[PDB]
Every structure is written in structure tokens, then in C-alpha cells.
Amino acid sequence: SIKVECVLRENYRCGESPVWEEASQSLLFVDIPSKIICRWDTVSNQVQRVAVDAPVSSVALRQLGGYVATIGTKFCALNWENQSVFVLAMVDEDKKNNRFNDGKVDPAGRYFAGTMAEETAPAVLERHQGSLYSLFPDHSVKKYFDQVDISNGLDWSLDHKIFYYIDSLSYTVDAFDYDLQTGQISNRRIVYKMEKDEQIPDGMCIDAEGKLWVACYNGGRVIRLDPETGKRLQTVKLPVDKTTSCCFGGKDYSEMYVTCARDGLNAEGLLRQPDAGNIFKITGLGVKGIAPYSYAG
Ligand SMILES: OC[C@@H](O)[C@H](O)[C@@H](O)CO
Numbered sequence: 001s002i003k004v005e006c007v008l009r010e011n012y013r014c015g016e017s018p019v020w021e022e023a024s025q026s027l028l029f030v031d032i033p034s035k036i037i038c039r040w041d042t043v044s045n046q047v048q049r050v051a052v053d054a055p056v057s058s059v060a061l062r063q064l065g066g067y068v069a070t071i072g073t074k075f076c077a078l079n080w081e082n083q084s085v086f087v088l089a090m091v092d093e094d095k096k097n098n099r100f101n102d103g104k105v106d107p108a109g110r111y112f113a114g115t116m117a118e119e120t121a122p123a124v125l126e127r128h129q130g131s132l133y134s135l136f137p138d139h140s141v142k143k144y145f146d147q148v149d150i151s152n153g154l155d156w157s158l159d160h161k162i163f164y165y166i167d168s169l170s171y172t173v174d175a176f177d178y179d180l181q182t183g184q185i186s187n188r189r190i191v192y193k194m195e196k197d198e199q200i201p202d203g204m205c206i207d208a209e210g211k212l213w214v215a216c217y218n219g220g221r222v223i224r225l226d227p228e229t230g231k232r233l234q235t236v237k238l239p240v241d242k243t244t245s246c247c248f249g250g251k252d253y254s255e256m257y258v259t260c261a262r263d264g265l266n267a268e269g270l271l272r273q274p275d276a277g278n279i280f281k282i283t284g285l286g287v288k289g290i291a292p293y294s295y296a297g
């Protein structure tokens with residue numbers, strides 16, 4: 001009953017940060033090196049893009065209206081109507097060549113996002129240059145920890161007491177104790193160790209049963225994980241190797257959207273993966289996800 005299909009054939013270089021906007025039945029996402037934030041209306045099937053002036057690594061809903069995004073090393077606010085973009089806060093000012101990577105809004109409306117050194121090739125970069133940050137609703141920025149290689153997938157337990165986090169080049173999914181009222185975290189530990197054939201852990205989202213789904217970059221799959229036991233529950237393969245992230249969307253969050261990349265593929269790889277860069281949808285997983293939180297500033 002599980003069905004994997006390519007639903008948007010736009011050939012992004014590195015599709016990332018899919019977010020479901022139920023108010024419009026649209027998928028928001030980015031194409032990082034193409035410097036565009038995209039909004040795909042799934043019913044009219046039209047895509048609108050907002051071009052920005054540096055690589056844009058994530059996008060999130062903004063409660064008061066419009067969107068927020070991480071552009072370069074800056075948290076930014078976007079008005080979709082006039083396409084105006086302005087800076088809310090900047091991080092890593094002491095770094096010569098960093099950028100934000102994955103980000104997501106916590107259950108209290110704080111925009112978490114972490115950084116990385118810029119790559120010369122996939123996973124080829126100066127080590128330990130990133131940090132995890134969050135933009136609070138008052139536009140202040142909290143720095144959580146440094147020494148990150150590539151800040152990636154992240155989400156929160158349904159009871160709002162645990163934060164899950166991926167630094168891609170650590171090859172583990174980690175968990176922290178998390179305090180909803182203050183946004184503080186502590187007690188970092190490993191909850192899943194990636195197997196060799198699962199390649200690089202990238203984006204991540206939680207489902208309604210508290211299990212984690214992780215996109216496996218170079219692994220051509222998403223895997224479902226139980227963070228309580230440390231065991232993989234399920235693998236769903238896709239016809240593209242560089243699967244980057246995933247989120248739930250559609251009616252009652254019953255469908256999974258998966259982004260992927262064509263950057264880093266050679267000519268042979270492009271031919272073997274004609275849908276590299278496209279958006280996929282997975283139906284029939286038999287579990288639902290949850291709605292994204294909106295930034296509260
Ligand atoms: O395997 C990770 C990729 O190399 C990155 O460039 C992405 O930005 C991660 O989201």
C-alpha cells in the first residue's frame with residue numbers, strides 16, 4: 001500500500017526544508033544554492049519563488065503573517081506579497097565562510113537553526129565550525145553549543161520534553177532534555193546510530209506516534225526510528241540517492257513529502273536518477289505526522 005511518486009518535476013539543485021502550510025494546502029521549501037524560497041500550491045499546481053541574495057537553507061511559517069528563513073548566516077523575515085526581506089538577527093559574524101543549514105520552529109514558536117562551514121563538495125568542509133542557535137520571539141538569539149560539523153535534522157517529542165538533533169557528520173541522531181518554557185536543553189545523548197548503508201543522516205521529522213523519520217543523504221531512503229529503543233522500525237526507498245529531508249503534509253498530515261538533490265551527481269548519476277532534485281510524495285505509511293509550529297516573532 002506504500003506508494004512513492006514524483007509529484008513536482010522542477011529539477012532543484014538541492015531541495016531542502018519542506019514545510020506544509022495547511023492554510024493554503026501548499027508546500028514550502030528551498031533550493032539552497034539556487035537562492036530561492038519556493039511555495040508550491042498543490043491544488044493549482046503552480047510554484048511561486050522568491051529570489052534571495054545568498055544561499056537559503058530553511059524556511060518556516062511566521063505566525064503574525066508571511067514567513068521567516070535562514071539566508072546566509074542571517075535569520076530573516078519575508079513578506080510574500082511584496083517579496084520584501086529583512087534581517088531579524090545575524091550569527092557567526094566571526095566566521096569567514098559559514099552558512100545556516102537546517103532549521104525548524106519549536107513548540108513555543110522559537111526558530112531553531114544551526115550553521116556549518118561552507119562546502120567545497122558534499123560533506124567536504126572545515127570541521128566543527130557550526131553552532132546551534134535559536135531565534136526567540138523577541139528576536140534575541142540563544143547559542144546552544146558549538147563544534148558542529150553540519151547542523152541538520154531536528155524536531156521535538158510530542159510531550160515537549162525532548163529535543164532531537166542531527167549533526168550529519170556525527171552519523172547519529174541525538175536527544176536532549178528540553179524545557180518548553182525557556183527553550184533550554186541539556187543532557188545530550190545518542191538515540192540512533194546510523195548503519196553504513198544508511199549513509200548520511202540529513203533532515204528529520206517526528207510522527208504522531210513519536211517515532212522519527214530521517215532522510216538518508218546518499219542512501220536513497222527515509223528510515224523510521226524509535227528513539228526509545230534505538231532501533232530502526234522501517235525503511236522506505238526512493239529512486240533518488242540524495243534524499244535530503246522530509247515532512248508530513250496533505251489531509252490530516254497523512255502524506256510524506258521528501259526533498260532531494262542533483263548537486264554532486266556526475267553525468268552517469270544524473271542519467272540513473274532522472275528525477276534528482278524533484279519533490280516526492282509517499283502515501284500509505286499508515287501513520288500521520290503533526291502540523292509545523294509557526295515562529296512567534
Ligand atoms: O549531506 C548534507 C549536504 O552535503 C548539505 O549540503 C545540505 O545542506 C544538508 O542539508
Ligand SMILES: [Ca+2]
Binds near residue numbers: 203
Ligand atoms: Ca539538510
